[PDB]
Write a protein that binds this ligand. Structure first.
Ligand SMILES: *[C@@H]1O[C@H](CO)[C@@H](O[C@@H]2O[C@H](CO)[C@@H](O)[C@H](O)[C@H]2NC(C)=O)[C@H](O)[C@H]1NC(C)=O
Ligand SMILES: *[C@@H]1O[C@H](CO)[C@@H](O[C@@H]2O[C@H](CO)[C@@H](O)[C@H](O)[C@H]2NC(C)=O)[C@H](O)[C@H]1NC(C)=O
Ligand SMILES: *[C@@H]1O[C@H](CO)[C@@H](O[C@@H]2O[C@H](CO)[C@@H](O)[C@H](O)[C@H]2NC(C)=O)[C@H](O)[C@H]1NC(C)=O
Ligand SMILES: *[C@@H]1O[C@H](CO)[C@@H](O[C@@H]2O[C@H](CO)[C@@H](O)[C@H](O)[C@H]2NC(C)=O)[C@H](O)[C@H]1NC(C)=O
Ligand SMILES: *[C@@H]1O[C@H](CO)[C@@H](O[C@@H]2O[C@H](CO)[C@@H](O)[C@H](O)[C@H]2NC(C)=O)[C@H](O)[C@H]1NC(C)=O
Ligand SMILES: *[C@@H]1O[C@H](CO)[C@@H](O[C@@H]2O[C@H](CO)[C@@H](O)[C@H](O)[C@H]2NC(C)=O)[C@H](O)[C@H]1NC(C)=O
Ligand SMILES: *[C@@H]1O[C@H](CO)[C@@H](O[C@@H]2O[C@H](CO)[C@@H](O)[C@H](O)[C@H]2NC(C)=O)[C@H](O)[C@H]1NC(C)=O
Ligand SMILES: CC(=O)N[C@@H]1[C@@H](O)[C@H](O)[C@@H](CO)O[C@H]1O
Ligand SMILES: *[C@@H]1O[C@H](CO)[C@@H](O)[C@H](O)[C@H]1NC(C)=O
Ligand SMILES: *[C@@H]1O[C@H](CO)[C@@H](O)[C@H](O)[C@H]1NC(C)=O
Ligand SMILES: *[C@@H]1O[C@H](CO)[C@@H](O)[C@H](O)[C@H]1NC(C)=O
Ligand SMILES: *[C@@H]1O[C@H](CO)[C@@H](O)[C@H](O)[C@H]1NC(C)=O
Ligand SMILES: *[C@@H]1O[C@H](CO)[C@@H](O)[C@H](O)[C@H]1NC(C)=O
Ligand SMILES: *[C@@H]1O[C@H](CO)[C@@H](O)[C@H](O)[C@H]1NC(C)=O
Ligand SMILES: *[C@@H]1O[C@H](CO)[C@@H](O)[C@H](O)[C@H]1NC(C)=O
Lengths: 420, 166, 198
């Protein structure tokens, strides 16, 4: 079939109509970013000329290829640990949560460490780790930071984001009640503080239910972590193929080296081994080149993840879709094999109402504009209210400022401004 | 069939006709003794990368050695998820990572001798969180940080013909 | 070592050339790494084979060098685009992107040239001395709830004040510093105090 771009829609645009939300929702979106690769390293000599002296003495005639490939792979392996450090080691200190879990009704037990476990990881981190899956010179170098240390870093960042908000990124961690921190995060998206306080239990319940939905989504299906698994698979292929290229002949009489050495004298084993060496060296070069490109790709993804942990976790971003679909409130990191997973908590208006509107009004021939908000009318009376939540207020001089008169502005209307 | 390796008694369920077996790489993995009705698994002789851990020779010529992905058997010793470390003292105290090794193991040169240790992530700092307490600044500082960024490379050019067929 | 990021680059390229040069000293299976020696020793029918061997080796080496340089240039172009973004968003302006302009609240930045690179001096505002305070999200005056217009409420132990969130500048709680919404039967953590109407 010809695919559907989406459900068509028509916006009821009109010069005197505005839709304003009367309510909201708290969305929690999972953004998965791969950070590191497998620190693979190959002994070119042993891969090409395993346990062969004539083969190695012939290989020396090709110069520094062996060493150049080893150097490139070493650089890649260093770059991977550098990426991990850049992403998670954005904090000098290891903050910890108190036993008093009084967060205004907000629940973080499903992302904070489970101290009863051997690995100080969270439920969701365990889900993520469980949703993700030789003698020819190929070795796997262990990463510098163990998953336990990654988890310590994530716990530190989480505890800072909770207890102190964004202050632990600027500098010293400054404790503040979580609800007031969320009030700041609401005032940062054009919504007033009261909304949060008056809807605090509702907001906390929405947040906890969203976390539960995250648990369900990650437990049910694994495809969500594809961006990580794919990476692994790619590297695996690039290794398997490489190993497979040992079993080929490349024009020689055999794909084995000792068999040639046990059948031919040097004058001809040299030619056969030259063919084998050329083939295997070309295969190694192809592998290293593909791995350098993939490493560049992973470095880009890791720098993006670090920027997200800075502008998203350590702060509150006004960048759109950089930190989840919606108005960004905050985000929480959760490690994963060779990557990171941001839970972005966002404010999504949900219940909207039509209101007649007007850019200004007339009181005594003068024109009043809203200081912070818009003028609306339900049909009979006019109000001024903030533009991301319906909280109608009486129109006064404290909610508006005067500029000019009513012979200029277009769409201006009439109403009475109350002077306290 | 020539090779080098360690021959061990196998538990492979070889069939009466199967002479020997192979691994995924199309290399031998177990054989049947020509003179004995016995099967032998072949394990390649223990090998592994060898890395050198050192401070600057401007400081000292005293070093340590890491044998990668091996056991401290075939070789002041430390076994780690990376391999066998020799010449470095195992230390309980954790410090900043100076010379990275792996699996959280980092080394340095300290009062002298070389030491390995589980790296420390940073100073622990619990936060006095409560629903009625806030920490507010009374002061400030104007900090200046330095951020270096490469922009351009050397505009190298090469004549393929002259390089090859000068 | 502060400028390692720069020097590192140079070093890599140097290797990528020296290595390249050294690959001329190799035979690649030929009789001698020198072309003129082959020409002066052999006739075309065999000198062509030897030259063919050398050509293959050296062309492969050049391909490796060029590929490495393309990848390294991709990396350097990424760095340069980042640096241009930093100059636009950080020097020519004031960024609210955290840690993009140094650890702190970005005030401004100053550029400086450097060999094959640029150096940014990031001036930031770092809170340094912090004081504890008993706080509250609101207060009750006459059954109404007063929230701050721009700031937060605090208590030094006896009296309540309102001050900006990043600098202790306590003020008297009034109707000019606060706005009213709802009553005191809804908000959580609210307290009682007196609001001064000028
Ligand atoms: C805004 O939408 C939310 C989401 O449905 C509403 O929250 C529900 O409120 C009712 C009334 O107490 C509860 O029974 C539900 O359990 C709430 N749902 C959740 C997920 O918490 C809220 O009522 C809406 N507000 C307005 C003014 O319409
Ligand atoms: C935070 O959420 C978790 C999971 O939704 C709650 O854990 C449940 O707690 C109840 C009551 O203690 C138990 O009956 C369940 O078995 C728990 N489930 C799990 C998966 O642990 C936790 O209680 C919530 N926080 C608080 C303070 O209640
Ligand atoms: C538009 O808003 C005005 C004011 O909020 C509404 O007028 C109120 O009407 C109710 C009865 O419906 C009265 O009890 C209130 O005293 C009225 N308030 C004022 C300030 O006069 C009006 O009903 C609204 N119209 C619609 C269609 O919702
Ligand atoms: C809004 O109010 C103003 C002021 O009362 C109205 O201005 C009058 O417009 C009529 C029609 O053009 C004139 O005859 C009057 O002379 C105007 N007032 C004055 C004081 O001169 C305006 O028309 C009103 N508009 C709406 C849409 O109600
Ligand atoms: C805020 O901190 C600064 C320094 O961080 C204080 O400045 C000091 O002032 C005294 C008196 O003039 C000088 O002797 C010091 O040398 C200054 N320090 C520095 C680093 O220059 C300032 O007094 C503090 N103010 C408050 C209100 O705490
Ligand atoms: C908390 O702040 C209040 C108000 O700033 C302090 O009370 C004032 O104390 C000064 C010094 O004795 C008096 O001159 C004022 O008259 C007091 N306030 C009023 C309204 O008269 C109080 O002492 C402070 N408490 C602490 C522990 O610092
Ligand atoms: C702030 O003042 C209000 C009003 O006096 C207090 O609310 C009263 O509390 C008593 C004790 O429970 C009740 O009997 C009254 O009915 C309440 N009045 C109202 C209007 O709700 C409130 O307790 C005071 N706050 C504190 C912390 O003492
Ligand atoms: C206690 C002390 O001072 N140092 C300890 C040592 O006693 C202990 O045997 C060793 C175990 O690895 O760890 C270190
Ligand atoms: C607002 O009005 C338009 C057309 O006038 C209508 O399509 C839309 O459904 C209305 N909004 C709501 C929330 O009903
Ligand atoms: C809005 O559109 C209607 C219908 O075209 C028109 O009558 C009215 O004058 C317009 N008002 C403004 C302010 O453009
Ligand atoms: C020769 O090999 C056979 C294998 O079945 C064995 O039974 C026999 O003992 C061997 N003889 C000698 C002299 O080794
Ligand atoms: C050795 O290092 C010191 C500083 O650590 C320096 O002053 C000295 O010049 C260096 N000497 C040599 C020979 O490297
Ligand atoms: C090292 O050797 C011992 C003895 O055979 C063995 O028990 C241990 O498992 C080996 N190390 C690892 C990591 O397996
Ligand atoms: C604030 O109080 C907490 C404990 O309530 C304490 O840890 C912290 O040091 C205090 N702040 C200052 C500046 O003394
Ligand atoms: C604040 O926390 C304390 C315990 O630390 C608790 O007794 C109190 O009820 C909490 N306040 C609110 C409003 O829940």
């Amino acid at each position: 079939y010809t695919m559907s771009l989406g459900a068509e829609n028509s916006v009821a645009y009109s010069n005197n109509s505005i839709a304003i939300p009367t309510n909201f929702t708290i969305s929690v979106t999972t953004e998965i970013l791969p950070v590191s690769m497998t620190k693979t390293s190959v002994d070119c000599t042993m891969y090409i000329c395993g346990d062969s002296t004539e083969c190695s003495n012939l290989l020396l005639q090709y110069g520094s290829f062996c060493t150049q490939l080893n150097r490139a792979l070493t650089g890649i392996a260093v770059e991977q640990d550098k990426n991990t450090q850049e992403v998670f080691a954005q904090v000098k200190q290891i903050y910890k949560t108190p036993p008093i879990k009084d967060f205004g009704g907000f629940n973080f037990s499903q992302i904070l460490p489970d101290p009863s476990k051997p690995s100080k990881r969270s439920f969701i981190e365990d889900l993520l780790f469980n949703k993700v899956t030789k003698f020819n010179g190929l070795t796997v170098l262990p990463p510098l930071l163990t998953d336990e240390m990654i988890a310590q870093y994530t716990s530190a960042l989480l505890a800072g984001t909770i207890t102190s908000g964004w202050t632990f990124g600027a500098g010293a961690a400054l404790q503040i009640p979580f609800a007031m921190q969320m009030a700041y995060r609401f005032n940062g998206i054009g919504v007033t503080q009261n909304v949060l306080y008056e809807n605090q239990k509702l907001i906390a319940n929405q947040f906890n239910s969203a976390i539960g939905k995250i648990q369900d989504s990650l437990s049910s299906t694994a495809s969500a972590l594809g961006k990580l698994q794919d990476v692994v698979n790619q590297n695996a292929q690039a290794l398997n193929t490489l190993v497979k290229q040992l079993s080929s002949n490349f024009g020689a009489i055999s794909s084995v080296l000792n068999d040639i050495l046990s059948r031919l004298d040097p004058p001809e084993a040299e030619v056969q081994i030259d063919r084998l060496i050329t083939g295997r060296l070309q295969s190694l070069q192809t592998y290293v080149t593909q791995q350098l490109i993939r490493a560049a790709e992973i470095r880009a993804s890791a720098n993006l993840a670090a920027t997200k942990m800075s502008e998203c976790v350590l702060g509150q971003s006004k960048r759109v879709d950089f930190c989840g679909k919606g108005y960004h409130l905050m985000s929480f990191p959760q490690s994963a094999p060779h990557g990171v997973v941001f839970l972005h908590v966002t404010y999504v208006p949900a219940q909207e109402k039509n209101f007649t509107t007007a850019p200004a009004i007339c009181h005594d021939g003068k024109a009043h504009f809203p200081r912070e908000g818009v003028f609306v009318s339900n049909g009979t009376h006019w109000f001024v209210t903030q533009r991301n939540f319906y909280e109608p207020q009486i129109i006064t001089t404290d909610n508006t400022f005067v500029s000019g008169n009513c012979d200029v502005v277009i769409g201006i209307v009439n109403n009475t401004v109350y002077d306290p | 069939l020539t090779g080098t390796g360690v021959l061990t008694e196998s538990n492979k369920k070889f069939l009466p006709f199967q002479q020997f077996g192979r691994d995924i790489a199309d290399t031998t993995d177990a054989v049947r003794d020509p003179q004995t009705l016995e099967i032998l698994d072949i394990t390649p002789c223990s090998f592994g990368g060898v890395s050198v851990i050192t401070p600057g020779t401007n400081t000292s010529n005293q070093v340590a050695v890491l044998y990668q992905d091996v056991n401290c058997t075939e070789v002041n010793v430390f076994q780690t998820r990376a391999g066998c470390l020799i010449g470095a003292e195992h230390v309980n105290n954790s410090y900043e990572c100076d010379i990275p090794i792996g699996a959280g193991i980092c080394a340095s040169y300290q009062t002298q001798s070389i030491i390995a240790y589980t790296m420390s992530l940073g100073a622990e700092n619990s936060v006095a969180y409560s629903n009625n307490s806030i920490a507010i600044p009374t002061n400030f500082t104007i900090s200046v940080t330095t951020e270096i960024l490469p922009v351009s490379m050397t505009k190298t050019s090469v004549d393929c013909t002259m390089y090859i067929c000068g």
